[PDB]
Amino acid sequence: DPNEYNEFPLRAIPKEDLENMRTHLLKFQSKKKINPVTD
Amino acid sequence: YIPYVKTIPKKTAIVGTVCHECQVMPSMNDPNYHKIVEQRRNIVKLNNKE
Amino acid sequence: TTFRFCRDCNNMLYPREDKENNRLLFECRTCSYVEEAGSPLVYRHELITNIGETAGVVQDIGSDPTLPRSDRECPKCHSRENVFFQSQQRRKDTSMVLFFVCLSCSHIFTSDQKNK
Amino acid sequence: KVYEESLDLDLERSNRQVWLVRLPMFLAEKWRDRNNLHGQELGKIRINKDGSKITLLLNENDNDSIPHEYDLELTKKVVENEYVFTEQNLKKYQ
Numbered sequence: 198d199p200n201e202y203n204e205f206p207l208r209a210i211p212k213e214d215l216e217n218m219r220t221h222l223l224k225f226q227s228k229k230k231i232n233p234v235t236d
Numbered sequence: 237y238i239p240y241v242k243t244i245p246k247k248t249a250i251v252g253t254v255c256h257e258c259q260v261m262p263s264m265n266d267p268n269y270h271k272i273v274e275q276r277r278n279i280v281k282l283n284n285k286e
Numbered sequence: 287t288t289f290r291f292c293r294d295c296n297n298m299l300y301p302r303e304d305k306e307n308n309r310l311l312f313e314c315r316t317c318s319y320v321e322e323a324g325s326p327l328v329y330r331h332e333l334i335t336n337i338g339e340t341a342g343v344v345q346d347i348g349s350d351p352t353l354p355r356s357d358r359e360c361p362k363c364h365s366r367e368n369v370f371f372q373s374q375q376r377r378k379d380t381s382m383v384l385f386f387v388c389l390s391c392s393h394i395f396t397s398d399q400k401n402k
Numbered sequence: 403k404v405y406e407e408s409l410d411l412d413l414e415r416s417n418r419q420v421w422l423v424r425l426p427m428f429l430a431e432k433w434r435d436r437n438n439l440h441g442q443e444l445g446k447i448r449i450n451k452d453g454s455k456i457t458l459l460l461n462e463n464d465n466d467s468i469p470h471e472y473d474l475e476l477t478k479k480v481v482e483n484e485y486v487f488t489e490q491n492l493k494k495y496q
């Protein structure tokens with residue numbers, strides 16, 4: 198294919214910072230737009 | 237009000253906001269394709285119990 | 287009849303009257319959200335109802351092998367293939383009229399010759 | 403005195419674009435392993451200039467056992483009210 202695209206590299210997160218830390222998904226259940234930064 | 241509530245403090249931080257939801261699906265035009273189909277087929281054909 | 291739902295909490299609104307303007311308002315019962323009604327109808331109880339006559343019609347209705355076929359003409363695309371079925375309402379008072387679904391345009395027509 | 407760190411949620415890195423990706427069983431079984439992810443190259447994300455089509459191509463490290471090309475199907479172009487938050491332990495002295 199021709200170079201009609203902009204592909205960026207993808208690499209895994211180092212394990213040195215993934216230990217003793219848990220990353221979770223937060224889901225607001227509402228019909229509005231909830232944004233803790235401003236709201 | 238109630239004087240005591242027994243909270244459990246923890247260190248938390250918001251480290252991103254989801255903007256896209258993606259579903260990774262193997263391309264049907266890939267030369268290695270149909271090997272996953274064989275692997276998927278083998279899932280139902282396997283009997284763990286002895 | 288159309289049901290309305292609240293914007294701030296998703297709870298359903300209920301009718302209310304405003305004597306100041308003699309108008310119909312739909313107000314929430316928990317968070318005090320109001321919205322003027324677009325129609326004056328708030329209730330309907332159809333003792334004799336025809337809802338559900340063609341219930342179950344999908345984009346792939348013609349793929350069902352148990353449905354019968356017919357050679358009746360489709361009065362929207364002039365096609366002869368179609369699958370017909372009786373009314374899906376199980377009340378023991380409906381007529382035996384047949385509803386025809388075309389396999390070329392997904393158009394639904396009936397064989398009724400009394401009222402249509 | 404019990405804790406030597408702030409107990410308030412850190413809303414500083416929230417302005418960070420994140421993609422939620424659902425993986426197949428074969429790909430998820432090797433991408434979720436904690437005995438891996440040494441920072442190596444897991445592939446490249448390719449996006450068309452005009453958009454509407456995305457695909458990630460893996461490297462040749464798969465051992466020629468799984469497809470090297472995958473299509474990223476955007477189940478929700480506009481994802482709303484979903485966030486990612488971490489969890490860490492607090493220093494218990496002073």
Ligand SMILES: [Zn+2]
Pocket residue numbers: 292293294295296297314315316317318319
């Ligand atoms: Zn309300």
Ligand SMILES: [Zn+2]
Pocket residue numbers: 360361362363364365388389390391392393
């Ligand atoms: Zn027709």
